[PDB]
Amino acid sequence: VAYDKKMDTNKDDPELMLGRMRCLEALGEWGQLHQQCCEKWTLVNDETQAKMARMAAAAAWGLGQWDSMEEYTCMIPRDTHDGAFYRAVLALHQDLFSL
């Protein structure tokens, strides 16, 4: 509700969308989350796309679009735990039982 009010003013800079992507994440609603993600994934910077990448992957898995999951996951840095985990689940879904 707070971010709804806060953004009733206008669309603004980063650190301001990430919050309500996160709340929609924690609430567990994925469809609206992906609706938001697609509308804005392009017209935003890269290091910010990096910030929303994990959310994009999680919502995409929620909707079962691995075609979207694979294009989302190719940005996540390798040193990150969640990046490795999501790459592993992506590969396991497509039956590559060696890597």
CSV table of N, CA, C and O in Angstrom, one decimal:
chain,number,residue,atom,x,y,z
A,1,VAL,N,0.8,-1.2,0.0
A,1,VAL,CA,0.0,0.0,0.0
A,1,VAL,C,0.9,1.3,0.0
A,1,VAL,O,0.5,2.2,-0.7
A,2,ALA,N,2.0,1.2,0.7
A,2,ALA,CA,2.9,2.4,0.8
A,2,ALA,C,3.5,2.7,-0.5
A,2,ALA,O,3.5,3.9,-0.9
A,3,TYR,N,3.9,1.7,-1.3
A,3,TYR,CA,4.4,2.0,-2.6
A,3,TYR,C,3.4,2.4,-3.6
A,3,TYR,O,3.6,3.2,-4.5
A,4,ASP,N,2.1,1.8,-3.4
A,4,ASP,CA,1.0,2.3,-4.2
A,4,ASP,C,0.8,3.8,-4.0
A,4,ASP,O,0.8,4.6,-5.0
A,5,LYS,N,0.8,4.3,-2.8
A,5,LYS,CA,0.7,5.7,-2.5
A,5,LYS,C,1.9,6.5,-3.1
A,5,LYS,O,1.7,7.5,-3.7
A,6,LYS,N,3.1,6.0,-2.8
A,6,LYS,CA,4.3,6.6,-3.1
A,6,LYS,C,4.4,6.8,-4.6
A,6,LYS,O,5.0,7.8,-5.1
A,7,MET,N,3.9,5.9,-5.4
A,7,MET,CA,4.0,5.9,-6.9
A,7,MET,C,2.8,6.5,-7.5
A,7,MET,O,2.7,6.8,-8.7
A,8,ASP,N,1.7,6.8,-6.7
A,8,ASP,CA,0.6,7.6,-7.2
A,8,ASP,C,1.1,8.9,-7.6
A,8,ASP,O,0.4,9.6,-8.4
A,9,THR,N,2.2,9.4,-7.0
A,9,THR,CA,2.7,10.7,-7.5
A,9,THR,C,3.2,10.6,-8.9
A,9,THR,O,2.7,11.4,-9.8
A,10,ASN,N,4.1,9.7,-9.3
A,10,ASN,CA,4.7,9.6,-10.6
A,10,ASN,C,5.6,8.4,-10.6
A,10,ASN,O,5.9,7.8,-9.6
A,11,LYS,N,6.0,8.0,-11.8
A,11,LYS,CA,7.1,7.0,-12.0
A,11,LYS,C,8.4,7.8,-11.9
A,11,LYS,O,8.6,8.8,-12.5
A,12,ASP,N,9.3,7.2,-11.1
A,12,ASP,CA,10.6,7.8,-10.7
A,12,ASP,C,11.7,6.8,-10.9
A,12,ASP,O,11.6,5.8,-11.5
A,13,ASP,N,12.9,7.3,-10.3
A,13,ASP,CA,14.1,6.6,-10.4
A,13,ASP,C,14.2,5.2,-9.8
A,13,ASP,O,13.2,4.8,-9.2
A,14,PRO,N,15.3,4.5,-10.0
A,14,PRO,CA,15.4,3.2,-9.3
A,14,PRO,C,15.4,3.2,-7.8
A,14,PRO,O,15.3,4.3,-7.3
A,15,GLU,N,15.5,2.1,-7.2
A,15,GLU,CA,15.3,1.9,-5.7
A,15,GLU,C,13.8,2.1,-5.4
A,15,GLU,O,13.5,2.1,-4.2
A,16,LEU,N,13.0,2.4,-6.3
A,16,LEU,CA,11.6,2.8,-6.1
A,16,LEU,C,10.6,1.8,-6.7
A,16,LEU,O,9.5,1.7,-6.3
A,17,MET,N,11.0,1.1,-7.8
A,17,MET,CA,10.3,0.0,-8.3
A,17,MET,C,10.7,-1.3,-7.6
A,17,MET,O,9.8,-2.2,-7.4
A,18,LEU,N,12.0,-1.5,-7.3
A,18,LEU,CA,12.5,-2.7,-6.8
A,18,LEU,C,11.7,-3.1,-5.5
A,18,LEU,O,11.5,-4.3,-5.3
A,19,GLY,N,11.4,-2.1,-4.7
A,19,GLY,CA,10.6,-2.4,-3.5
A,19,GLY,C,9.3,-3.1,-3.7
A,19,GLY,O,9.1,-4.1,-3.1
A,20,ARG,N,8.5,-2.7,-4.7
A,20,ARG,CA,7.3,-3.4,-4.8
A,20,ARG,C,7.3,-4.6,-5.7
A,20,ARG,O,6.5,-5.5,-5.6
A,21,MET,N,8.4,-4.7,-6.6
A,21,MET,CA,8.6,-6.0,-7.1
A,21,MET,C,8.9,-7.0,-6.0
A,21,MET,O,8.4,-8.1,-6.0
A,22,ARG,N,9.7,-6.6,-5.0
A,22,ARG,CA,10.0,-7.5,-3.9
A,22,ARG,C,8.7,-7.8,-3.1
A,22,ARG,O,8.6,-8.9,-2.6
A,23,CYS,N,7.9,-6.8,-2.8
A,23,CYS,CA,6.7,-7.1,-2.0
A,23,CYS,C,5.8,-8.1,-2.8
A,23,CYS,O,5.2,-9.0,-2.2
A,24,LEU,N,5.6,-7.9,-4.1
A,24,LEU,CA,4.8,-8.8,-4.9
A,24,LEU,C,5.5,-10.2,-4.9
A,24,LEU,O,4.8,-11.2,-5.0
A,25,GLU,N,6.8,-10.3,-4.9
A,25,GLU,CA,7.5,-11.5,-4.7
A,25,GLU,C,7.1,-12.2,-3.4
A,25,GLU,O,6.6,-13.3,-3.4
A,26,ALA,N,7.4,-11.6,-2.3
A,26,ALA,CA,7.2,-12.2,-1.0
A,26,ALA,C,5.7,-12.5,-0.8
A,26,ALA,O,5.5,-13.6,-0.2
A,27,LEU,N,4.8,-11.8,-1.3
A,27,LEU,CA,3.4,-12.1,-1.3
A,27,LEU,C,3.1,-13.4,-2.0
A,27,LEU,O,2.3,-14.2,-1.6
A,28,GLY,N,3.9,-13.7,-3.1
A,28,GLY,CA,3.8,-14.9,-3.9
A,28,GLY,C,2.9,-14.8,-5.1
A,28,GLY,O,2.7,-15.8,-5.7
A,29,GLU,N,2.5,-13.6,-5.5
A,29,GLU,CA,1.7,-13.4,-6.7
A,29,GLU,C,2.7,-13.3,-7.9
A,29,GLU,O,3.5,-12.3,-7.8
A,30,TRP,N,2.7,-14.1,-8.9
A,30,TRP,CA,3.7,-14.1,-9.9
A,30,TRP,C,3.2,-13.4,-11.2
A,30,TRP,O,4.0,-12.8,-11.8
A,31,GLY,N,2.0,-13.6,-11.5
A,31,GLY,CA,1.5,-13.1,-12.8
A,31,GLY,C,1.6,-11.6,-12.9
A,31,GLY,O,2.1,-11.0,-13.9
A,32,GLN,N,1.1,-10.8,-11.9
A,32,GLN,CA,1.3,-9.4,-11.9
A,32,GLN,C,2.7,-9.0,-11.8
A,32,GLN,O,3.1,-8.0,-12.4
A,33,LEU,N,3.5,-9.8,-11.2
A,33,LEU,CA,5.0,-9.5,-11.1
A,33,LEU,C,5.6,-9.6,-12.5
A,33,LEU,O,6.4,-8.7,-12.9
A,34,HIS,N,5.3,-10.6,-13.3
A,34,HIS,CA,5.8,-10.7,-14.6
A,34,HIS,C,5.2,-9.6,-15.5
A,34,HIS,O,5.9,-9.1,-16.4
A,35,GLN,N,3.9,-9.3,-15.3
A,35,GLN,CA,3.3,-8.2,-16.0
A,35,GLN,C,4.2,-6.9,-15.9
A,35,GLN,O,4.5,-6.2,-16.8
A,36,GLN,N,4.5,-6.6,-14.6
A,36,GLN,CA,5.4,-5.5,-14.3
A,36,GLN,C,6.7,-5.6,-15.0
A,36,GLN,O,7.2,-4.7,-15.6
A,37,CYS,N,7.3,-6.8,-14.9
A,37,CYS,CA,8.7,-7.0,-15.4
A,37,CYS,C,8.8,-6.8,-16.9
A,37,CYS,O,9.7,-6.1,-17.3
A,38,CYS,N,7.9,-7.3,-17.6
A,38,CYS,CA,7.9,-7.2,-19.1
A,38,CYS,C,7.8,-5.8,-19.5
A,38,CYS,O,8.5,-5.3,-20.4
A,39,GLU,N,6.9,-5.0,-18.9
A,39,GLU,CA,6.7,-3.6,-19.3
A,39,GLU,C,7.9,-2.7,-19.1
A,39,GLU,O,7.9,-1.7,-19.7
A,40,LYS,N,8.8,-3.1,-18.2
A,40,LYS,CA,9.9,-2.2,-17.9
A,40,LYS,C,11.3,-2.8,-18.0
A,40,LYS,O,12.3,-2.1,-17.8
A,41,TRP,N,11.4,-4.1,-18.4
A,41,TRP,CA,12.7,-4.7,-18.4
A,41,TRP,C,13.6,-4.0,-19.4
A,41,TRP,O,14.8,-4.0,-19.2
A,42,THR,N,13.1,-3.5,-20.5
A,42,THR,CA,13.9,-2.9,-21.5
A,42,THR,C,14.3,-1.5,-21.1
A,42,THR,O,15.5,-1.2,-21.0
A,43,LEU,N,13.4,-0.6,-20.9
A,43,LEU,CA,13.7,0.8,-20.6
A,43,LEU,C,14.2,1.0,-19.2
A,43,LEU,O,13.7,1.8,-18.4
A,44,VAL,N,15.3,0.3,-18.9
A,44,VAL,CA,16.0,0.4,-17.6
A,44,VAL,C,17.4,0.0,-17.8
A,44,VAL,O,17.7,-0.8,-18.7
A,45,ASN,N,18.3,0.5,-17.0
A,45,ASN,CA,19.7,0.3,-17.1
A,45,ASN,C,20.1,-1.2,-16.9
A,45,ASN,O,19.2,-2.0,-16.6
A,46,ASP,N,21.4,-1.5,-17.1
A,46,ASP,CA,21.8,-2.9,-17.0
A,46,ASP,C,22.1,-3.4,-15.6
A,46,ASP,O,21.6,-4.5,-15.2
A,47,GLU,N,22.9,-2.6,-14.8
A,47,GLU,CA,23.1,-3.0,-13.4
A,47,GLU,C,21.9,-3.1,-12.6
A,47,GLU,O,21.8,-3.7,-11.6
A,48,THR,N,20.8,-2.4,-13.1
A,48,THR,CA,19.5,-2.6,-12.5
A,48,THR,C,18.8,-3.8,-13.0
A,48,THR,O,18.1,-4.5,-12.3
A,49,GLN,N,18.9,-4.1,-14.3
A,49,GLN,CA,18.4,-5.4,-14.8
A,49,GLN,C,19.1,-6.5,-14.1
A,49,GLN,O,18.5,-7.5,-13.8
A,50,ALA,N,20.3,-6.3,-13.7
A,50,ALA,CA,21.0,-7.2,-12.8
A,50,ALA,C,20.3,-7.4,-11.5
A,50,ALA,O,20.1,-8.5,-11.0
A,51,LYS,N,19.8,-6.3,-10.9
A,51,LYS,CA,19.1,-6.3,-9.6
A,51,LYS,C,17.8,-7.1,-9.8
A,51,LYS,O,17.4,-7.8,-8.9
A,52,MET,N,17.1,-6.8,-10.9
A,52,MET,CA,15.8,-7.5,-11.0
A,52,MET,C,15.8,-8.9,-11.7
A,52,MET,O,14.8,-9.5,-11.9
A,53,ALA,N,17.0,-9.3,-12.1
A,53,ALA,CA,17.2,-10.6,-12.7
A,53,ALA,C,16.7,-11.8,-11.9
A,53,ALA,O,16.0,-12.7,-12.4
A,54,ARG,N,17.0,-11.8,-10.6
A,54,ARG,CA,16.6,-12.9,-9.8
A,54,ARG,C,15.1,-13.0,-9.7
A,54,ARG,O,14.5,-14.1,-9.8
A,55,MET,N,14.5,-11.8,-9.5
A,55,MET,CA,13.0,-11.7,-9.5
A,55,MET,C,12.4,-12.2,-10.8
A,55,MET,O,11.4,-12.9,-10.8
A,56,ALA,N,13.0,-11.8,-11.9
A,56,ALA,CA,12.5,-12.2,-13.2
A,56,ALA,C,12.5,-13.7,-13.3
A,56,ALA,O,11.5,-14.3,-13.7
A,57,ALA,N,13.6,-14.3,-12.9
A,57,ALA,CA,13.7,-15.8,-13.0
A,57,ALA,C,12.7,-16.4,-12.1
A,57,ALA,O,12.0,-17.4,-12.5
A,58,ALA,N,12.5,-15.9,-10.9
A,58,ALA,CA,11.6,-16.5,-9.9
A,58,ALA,C,10.1,-16.5,-10.5
A,58,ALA,O,9.4,-17.5,-10.5
A,59,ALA,N,9.7,-15.3,-10.9
A,59,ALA,CA,8.4,-15.1,-11.5
A,59,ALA,C,8.2,-16.0,-12.7
A,59,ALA,O,7.1,-16.6,-12.9
A,60,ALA,N,9.2,-16.0,-13.6
A,60,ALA,CA,9.1,-16.8,-14.8
A,60,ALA,C,8.9,-18.3,-14.5
A,60,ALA,O,8.1,-19.0,-15.1
A,61,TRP,N,9.7,-18.8,-13.5
A,61,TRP,CA,9.4,-20.2,-13.0
A,61,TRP,C,8.0,-20.3,-12.5
A,61,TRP,O,7.4,-21.4,-12.7
A,62,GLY,N,7.5,-19.3,-11.8
A,62,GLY,CA,6.2,-19.4,-11.3
A,62,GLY,C,5.2,-19.5,-12.4
A,62,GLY,O,4.2,-20.3,-12.2
A,63,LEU,N,5.4,-18.9,-13.5
A,63,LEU,CA,4.5,-19.0,-14.7
A,63,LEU,C,5.0,-20.1,-15.6
A,63,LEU,O,4.2,-20.4,-16.6
A,64,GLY,N,6.1,-20.8,-15.4
A,64,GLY,CA,6.5,-21.9,-16.2
A,64,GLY,C,6.9,-21.5,-17.6
A,64,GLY,O,6.5,-22.2,-18.6
A,65,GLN,N,7.6,-20.3,-17.8
A,65,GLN,CA,8.1,-20.0,-19.1
A,65,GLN,C,9.6,-20.1,-19.1
A,65,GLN,O,10.4,-19.1,-18.9
A,66,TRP,N,10.1,-21.3,-19.3
A,66,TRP,CA,11.6,-21.5,-19.3
A,66,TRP,C,12.2,-20.8,-20.5
A,66,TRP,O,13.4,-20.4,-20.4
A,67,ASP,N,11.5,-20.6,-21.6
A,67,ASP,CA,12.1,-19.7,-22.6
A,67,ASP,C,12.4,-18.3,-22.1
A,67,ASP,O,13.4,-17.8,-22.5
A,68,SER,N,11.5,-17.8,-21.2
A,68,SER,CA,11.9,-16.6,-20.6
A,68,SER,C,12.9,-16.7,-19.5
A,68,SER,O,13.8,-15.9,-19.3
A,69,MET,N,12.9,-17.9,-18.8
A,69,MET,CA,13.9,-18.1,-17.7
A,69,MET,C,15.3,-18.1,-18.3
A,69,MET,O,16.2,-17.5,-17.6
A,70,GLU,N,15.5,-18.7,-19.4
A,70,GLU,CA,16.9,-18.9,-19.9
A,70,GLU,C,17.4,-17.5,-20.4
A,70,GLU,O,18.6,-17.2,-20.1
A,71,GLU,N,16.6,-16.7,-21.0
A,71,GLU,CA,17.0,-15.4,-21.4
A,71,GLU,C,17.2,-14.4,-20.2
A,71,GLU,O,18.0,-13.5,-20.2
A,72,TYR,N,16.4,-14.7,-19.1
A,72,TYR,CA,16.6,-13.9,-17.9
A,72,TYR,C,17.9,-14.3,-17.2
A,72,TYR,O,18.7,-13.4,-16.7
A,73,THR,N,18.2,-15.6,-17.1
A,73,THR,CA,19.3,-16.1,-16.3
A,73,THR,C,20.7,-15.7,-16.8
A,73,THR,O,21.7,-15.8,-16.1
A,74,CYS,N,20.8,-15.4,-18.1
A,74,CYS,CA,22.1,-15.3,-18.7
A,74,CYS,C,22.8,-14.0,-18.3
A,74,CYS,O,24.0,-13.8,-18.6
A,75,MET,N,22.1,-13.1,-17.5
A,75,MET,CA,22.7,-11.9,-16.9
A,75,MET,C,23.3,-12.2,-15.5
A,75,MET,O,24.2,-11.4,-15.1
A,76,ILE,N,22.7,-13.1,-14.8
A,76,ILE,CA,23.1,-13.2,-13.4
A,76,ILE,C,24.5,-13.6,-13.2
A,76,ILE,O,25.0,-14.5,-13.9
A,77,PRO,N,25.3,-12.9,-12.3
A,77,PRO,CA,26.7,-13.2,-12.2
A,77,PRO,C,26.9,-14.6,-11.6
A,77,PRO,O,26.1,-15.1,-10.9
A,78,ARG,N,28.0,-15.2,-12.0
A,78,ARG,CA,28.3,-16.5,-11.7
A,78,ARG,C,28.8,-16.7,-10.2
A,78,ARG,O,28.5,-17.8,-9.6
A,79,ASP,N,29.4,-15.7,-9.6
A,79,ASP,CA,29.8,-15.8,-8.2
A,79,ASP,C,28.7,-15.9,-7.2
A,79,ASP,O,28.9,-16.2,-6.1
A,80,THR,N,27.5,-15.5,-7.7
A,80,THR,CA,26.3,-15.5,-6.8
A,80,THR,C,25.7,-16.9,-6.6
A,80,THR,O,25.6,-17.7,-7.6
A,81,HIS,N,25.4,-17.2,-5.4
A,81,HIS,CA,24.8,-18.5,-5.1
A,81,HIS,C,23.5,-18.7,-5.8
A,81,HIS,O,23.4,-19.8,-6.5
A,82,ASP,N,22.6,-17.8,-5.8
A,82,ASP,CA,21.3,-17.9,-6.5
A,82,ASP,C,21.5,-18.1,-8.0
A,82,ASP,O,20.7,-18.8,-8.6
A,83,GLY,N,22.5,-17.4,-8.5
A,83,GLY,CA,22.7,-17.6,-10.0
A,83,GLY,C,23.1,-19.0,-10.3
A,83,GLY,O,22.5,-19.6,-11.3
A,84,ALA,N,24.0,-19.6,-9.6
A,84,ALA,CA,24.3,-21.0,-9.8
A,84,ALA,C,23.1,-21.9,-9.6
A,84,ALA,O,22.9,-22.8,-10.4
A,85,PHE,N,22.4,-21.6,-8.6
A,85,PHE,CA,21.2,-22.5,-8.3
A,85,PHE,C,20.2,-22.4,-9.5
A,85,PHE,O,19.7,-23.4,-9.9
A,86,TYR,N,19.9,-21.2,-10.0
A,86,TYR,CA,19.0,-21.1,-11.0
A,86,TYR,C,19.5,-21.6,-12.3
A,86,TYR,O,18.7,-22.2,-13.1
A,87,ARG,N,20.8,-21.5,-12.6
A,87,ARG,CA,21.3,-22.1,-13.8
A,87,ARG,C,21.2,-23.6,-13.7
A,87,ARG,O,20.9,-24.3,-14.7
A,88,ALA,N,21.4,-24.2,-12.5
A,88,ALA,CA,21.3,-25.6,-12.3
A,88,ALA,C,19.9,-26.1,-12.5
A,88,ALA,O,19.7,-27.1,-13.2
A,89,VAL,N,18.9,-25.4,-12.0
A,89,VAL,CA,17.5,-25.8,-12.2
A,89,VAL,C,17.1,-25.7,-13.6
A,89,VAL,O,16.4,-26.6,-14.2
A,90,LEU,N,17.6,-24.6,-14.3
A,90,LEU,CA,17.3,-24.5,-15.7
A,90,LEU,C,17.8,-25.7,-16.5
A,90,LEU,O,17.1,-26.3,-17.3
A,91,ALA,N,19.1,-26.0,-16.3
A,91,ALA,CA,19.7,-27.1,-17.0
A,91,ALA,C,19.0,-28.5,-16.7
A,91,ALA,O,18.7,-29.3,-17.6
A,92,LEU,N,18.7,-28.7,-15.4
A,92,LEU,CA,18.0,-29.9,-15.0
A,92,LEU,C,16.6,-30.0,-15.7
A,92,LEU,O,16.2,-31.2,-16.0
A,93,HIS,N,16.0,-28.9,-15.9
A,93,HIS,CA,14.7,-29.0,-16.5
A,93,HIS,C,14.8,-29.5,-18.0
A,93,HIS,O,13.9,-30.2,-18.5
A,94,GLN,N,15.9,-29.3,-18.6
A,94,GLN,CA,16.1,-29.7,-20.0
A,94,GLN,C,17.0,-30.9,-20.1
A,94,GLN,O,17.4,-31.3,-21.2
A,95,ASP,N,17.2,-31.6,-19.0
A,95,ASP,CA,17.7,-33.0,-19.0
A,95,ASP,C,19.2,-33.0,-19.6
A,95,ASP,O,19.4,-33.7,-20.6
A,96,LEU,N,20.0,-32.3,-18.9
A,96,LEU,CA,21.5,-32.4,-19.2
A,96,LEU,C,22.1,-32.8,-17.8
A,96,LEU,O,22.6,-32.0,-17.0
A,97,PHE,N,22.1,-34.1,-17.7
A,97,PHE,CA,22.4,-34.7,-16.3
A,97,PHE,C,23.9,-34.9,-16.1
A,97,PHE,O,24.2,-35.7,-15.2
A,98,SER,N,24.7,-34.1,-16.7
A,98,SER,CA,26.1,-34.2,-16.4
A,98,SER,C,26.7,-32.9,-15.8
A,98,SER,O,27.3,-32.9,-14.7
A,99,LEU,N,26.4,-31.7,-16.4
A,99,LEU,CA,26.9,-30.5,-15.8
A,99,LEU,C,26.3,-30.1,-14.5
A,99,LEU,O,26.9,-29.5,-13.7
